[PDB]
Nucleic acid binder design. Structure first.
Ligand SMILES: [K+]
Ligand SMILES: [K+]
Ligand SMILES: [K+]
Ligand SMILES: [K+]
Ligand SMILES: [Mg+2]
Ligand SMILES: [Mg+2]
Ligand SMILES: [Mg+2]
Ligand SMILES: [Mg+2]
Ligand SMILES: [Mg+2]
Ligand SMILES: [Mg+2]
Ligand SMILES: [Mg+2]
Ligand SMILES: [Mg+2]
Length: 176
RNA sequence: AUCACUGGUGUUCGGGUUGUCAUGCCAAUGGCACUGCCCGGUAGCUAAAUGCGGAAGAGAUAAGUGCUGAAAGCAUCUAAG
């Protein structure tokens, strides 16, 4: 509703294309396409997209609000792009990128190699930092979640793979 | 599952031996006595013998964990995906 009302602006250089429900956004950072829910009517208008419910759908305003938030992320994706940062905490925990495969040393008796998906790249500044980059906000979120899952932050020392902007509450071992 | 090995059985293979009857007798043999009683043992069957098995992988999930995400300007694993 309120989210669906605010239209999204197409900055210069971004080219939208609507084939019924299938949309395609093309920018300097790549090309993203989505099939919108059959209850959403989207209009290109004058360098600004608008979103509204179609007639005969009881949830059109809920479906238009999500279609708006996604297309707004698609436009940001093909220009500024998205970035996620992860830190490793713990003596001996290290990371390193070789091609599109991240090598994790997380205290296991075996190595952890994580293959990145199609349009995601990863740089390791220090050995305890990973920086992901990509145009798809959902994909970069999934990749970061998969890397965090190898060694979730534990509550007694905060050790593991954490999001850089993550608050990790710790607690003290029970006395006696 | 199998019998190469280790073994059991092995009244159809060989031997020892008690009592008695017979083959004229000696010598040699056979019958009967739980296979007379025993000692070994071939093939076969067999276990205690010795080979092998339970999986890996894949698909769709349970509880559970998430990503993106509005309805509800926030939040939200869910309503779409
Ligand atoms: K045998
Ligand atoms: K035998
Ligand atoms: K006799
Ligand atoms: K969320
Ligand atoms: Mg034999
Ligand atoms: Mg024997
Ligand atoms: Mg015998
Ligand atoms: Mg005589
Ligand atoms: Mg007689
Ligand atoms: Mg008689
Ligand atoms: Mg399995
Ligand atoms: Mg949201």
């Amino acid at each position: 509703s309120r989210v669906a009302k605010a239209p999204v602006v197409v900055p210069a250089g971004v080219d939208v294309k609507i084939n019924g429900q299938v949309i395609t956004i093309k920018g300097k950072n790549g090309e993203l396409t989505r099939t919108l829910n059959d209850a959403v009517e989207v209009k290109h208008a004058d360098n600004t997209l608008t979103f509204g419910p179609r007639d005969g759908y009881a949830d059109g305003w809920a479906q238009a609000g999500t279609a708006r938030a996604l297309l707004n992320s698609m436009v940001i994706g093909v220009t500024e792009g998205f970035t996620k940062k992860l830190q490793l905490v713990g003596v001996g925990y290290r990371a390193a990128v070789k091609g599109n495969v991240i090598n994790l040393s997380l205290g296991f008796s075996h190595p952890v190699d994580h293959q990145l998906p199609a349009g995601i790249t990863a740089e390791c500044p220090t050995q305890t930092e990973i920086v992901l980059k990509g145009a798809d906000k959902q994909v970069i979120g999934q990749v970061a979640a998969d890397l965090r899952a190898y060694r979730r932050p534990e509550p007694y020392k905060g050790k593991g793979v954490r999001y850089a902007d993550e608050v990790v509450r710790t607690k003290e071992a029970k006395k006696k």
